[PDB]
Amino acid sequence: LRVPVIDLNRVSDEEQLLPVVRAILLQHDTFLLKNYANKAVLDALLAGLTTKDLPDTSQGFDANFVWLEQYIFDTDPQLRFDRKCRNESLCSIYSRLFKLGLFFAQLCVKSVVSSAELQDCISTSHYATKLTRYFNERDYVTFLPTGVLTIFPCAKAIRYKPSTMATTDNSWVSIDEPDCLLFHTGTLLARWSQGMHTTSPLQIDPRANIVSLTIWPPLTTPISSKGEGTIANHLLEQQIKAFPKVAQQYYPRELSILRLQDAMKFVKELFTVCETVLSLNALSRSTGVPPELHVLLPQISSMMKRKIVQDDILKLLTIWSDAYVVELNSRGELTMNLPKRDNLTTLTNKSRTLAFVERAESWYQQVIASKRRSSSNSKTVLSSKVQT
């Protein structure tokens, strides 16, 4: 939970603060920048983000559906896409903070590989200012930043959702530093640096005013060697968009199912918790006992901390049928068991996980020939009905 403070006039020395700033973004992620050349022009922008008059058109304040309002103002050079109200202070800060992004990129990549390779990373300067207004706060669900380098002013506004990077004790920490410019690094920048960067979320806080500046790499730049197939523009364009834009852009091939954005990753971790909780009870050297569904749902509820409906286990049965028997006991409770009597070995547990992920890959692979996941709702398996 170390938060080193160093002047950014001393980084312009270039012989003493490159490793200190680099060591934090490889360990503590978000770095603390104080006393930038902007003084009273950063506090004069809080009266100009309250417009809220503009439509989306890859711009505009976007409220995902409600208290969360994200206003992104598309840069003027971009051809034939703009919405201009007034936004003079936003343009002046956009021109000034370009030097903060170029200088931060110069200090970041001069202790890694080369400081001459970032001039084509900032070349286009197409990044749009992101002005975030929260209504009078759970408005920010756990999420990751868009651009490679995000430098935002904030009052506090920042926590750390459960994840493992900065402050290795993995407790949620709220940090409030007066006179503070906080730098947020993106997911794609971690891929360019192959695992050096992470993310941090926003939490419930009294002050709803958040100004976030994310600087975007050009449309034509590939990312290392492996990203020659997926360019920074393609991956970041797939990442952000907007809810009206996701409705418009991702549209061409219908299916509001959207399971690719939704079910995949969450449903395939159900087997990992469920396989360990059926070896937690059924496997014991003491007094038998049959695995019941009433004591299984709360344990998986503890695993993900999320509410678990009893139908998710039925979806797990639909994808992998032969592991769990759905027979219902005479008392009304629905028991499940395993075919083996010699119990699940750790190697058999790993083989079951590989078989479950392979089966999910097979279902996703066969279902997507109709049109990336295409359309499935993860239909529940039919529960055997009691006779007569």
Added chain:
Amino acid sequence: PNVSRTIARELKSFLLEYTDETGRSVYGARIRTLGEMNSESLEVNYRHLAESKAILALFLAKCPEEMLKIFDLVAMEATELHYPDYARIHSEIHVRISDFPTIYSLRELRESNLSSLVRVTGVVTRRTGVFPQLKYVKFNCLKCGSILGPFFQDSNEEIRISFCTNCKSKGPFRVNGEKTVYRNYQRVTLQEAPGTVPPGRLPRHREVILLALVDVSKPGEEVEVTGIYKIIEANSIKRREVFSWTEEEEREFRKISRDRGIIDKIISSMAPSIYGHRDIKTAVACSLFGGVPKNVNGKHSIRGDINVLLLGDPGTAKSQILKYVEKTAHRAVFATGQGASAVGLTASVRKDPITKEWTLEGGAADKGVCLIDEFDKMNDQDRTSIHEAMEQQSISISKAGIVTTLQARCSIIAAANPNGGRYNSTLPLAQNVSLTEPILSRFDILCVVRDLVDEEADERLATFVVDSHVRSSPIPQELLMKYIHYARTKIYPKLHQMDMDKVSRVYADLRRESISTGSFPITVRHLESILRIAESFAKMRLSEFVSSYDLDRAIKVVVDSFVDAQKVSVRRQLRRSFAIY
């Protein structure tokens, strides 16, 4: 066995490879935080190593005592190659096994759960700490004056030694613990919570051992402990935390709350045994549903609870309403007098006779509602402790070597009787009750009943009580008690400055009229009380904010409590409040 040697090198390779989020090894940050702050507690989630190796999870679930001999050694080895000379200060470092999926109850503790890991919920009581307990003994034989020693754990009293080596005597033996083992104490008695116990049954209780985790637990709160079962030997404690709301019942609660003005239906559903009158149950329902606690920049904590006070002749029913809400409301604690229930509200240092020593305990529902019967019949300690808990929301313990200020944000429902039986309506309530004004000022609602001579009450009360004896429209009880827990844990209705300033106009009339005709005044606490009653009615209405007519019911609740708590000579105030009625 040598099989632990292939286990050790497996998890030694595991701690250096766990990168779950963004390729970052969180164990290096965990080991630098325990090494820089000199901690001995290491945190490991069960899901992490369970996703890595299920055989280690099966070994931890089967034999955790031999599984714990590998964990501390590999943690000390990792701390030694990460930090030099760490063994000079700290010899051993324990681990904290958290995130147990199968949370058990106290009534499911059976013979099959022996020598295994178990996560149980409960409430802690009986705090005895930092004492040297025993595990070995020696004994001095006085006849020949000799020494002999066995073993003694944590359940029996002591293993009588009565046969010497060569004396062959039954002489008097003395306990030598001047060559003996180390001691660590945390004798805590844990109990089952009353908000999840089935009806008809009694909550069980066990004894827990705490070693290496003392005085970080708060007595009278819900707790989650993960330990081994043999007497439970706790490994990890959690002070953050079966009748709960589901997805199939949460949509119908909004559908029920949207139609047909459910506030009066909840009022009619409050008393099924008798007819009653809405003045007791309106205060009871707004006290159990409660308001919201708010602070401004970390300070100025307002009390979100509502403490109601019942008064009247002892022939009427005042204990049946609290007896119904003790079963109905969650975490409801019925306490009485000197100590009918052998548990109280006040901190105390006292002697204990089971082992015959001195101990300290801060008695007891931090989110719940405490019910006090016969409020006028108490001593100085339980009056001052409830006055401190009614004034601010904390109770301090400053004795037996411990100093702890615990949270006391509980609602208070008190019932009392006047001096002499009769209410004596030609005198105020301050001359009627033996209590004074600042203990009366904490109670915002003062409900009082009287005697009814007329045929109306004779036609209804006797017929309902004879209908109850001749037999051997509202909201049902189960949906109501599930709605209480659903609304009290999800919403927080605020207020908007659009037209709320009008209540500051009507308070400006209502304060002034209490000076010229009445003797007792109205203060800012009544304004805080009607805002809490209006937000409690908005909580019961399940709205986003408080409406404009919730304050009308709030001002009706404060007029029929304050005007009714005075003489008959404030009768003009019965018609003076008729313009806003």
